[PDB]
């Protein structure tokens, strides 16, 4: 599964990190999960906000202030 | 990279659904991201809860609310 891909993509970043220290990766790993997911439930439900929404399980408000903070729509 | 694989997971999730509705699949992709950048922090950081909210650039009460959610801990 998609779980083992993050786990790797992790071991690989971690893997070259050295003295640089990391503060933010969790909303660095969100942003590339985000992203696609935002942009593949818009693709199917082809830019229906308020279907992608729901199949999200996710208030139409914040698809729309998801899409924002990304610059998709 | 990584959100080629959440492109990939994500036209294999829709394939299989043969016109069901979903409504969840926020939950459903963060889970699966969510524990293991949890468990591959927590090993990095040794098991030290406070170097792994700062490396994650959250605070300590939200990494114990996560780390409850998959019983991480």
Redesign the interface.
């Known amino acids: ?7 790797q ?3 690989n970043y ?1 893997a070259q990190l050295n003295g640089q ?7 660095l ?1 969100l942003a ?2 985000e ?3 935002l ?3 818009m693709q ?1 439900t082809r830019g229906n906000q308020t279907r992608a929404a ?5 208030n139409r408000g914040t698809l729309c202030k998801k899409l924002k903070k990304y610059g998709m729509n």
Chains 1, 2 share one sequence.
């Not at 599964?1 to 786990?7: H, M």
């Not at 220290?21 to 909303?27: C, I, K, P, R």
């Not at 729901?54 to 996710?58: A, C, K, N, S, T």
């Open positions: 599964p998609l779980r083992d891909s993050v786990k993509a992790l071991k971690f220290d990391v503060n933010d990766l969790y909303e790993v590339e999960v992203q696609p997911l942009d593949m439930v199917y729901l199949m999200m399980g996710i």
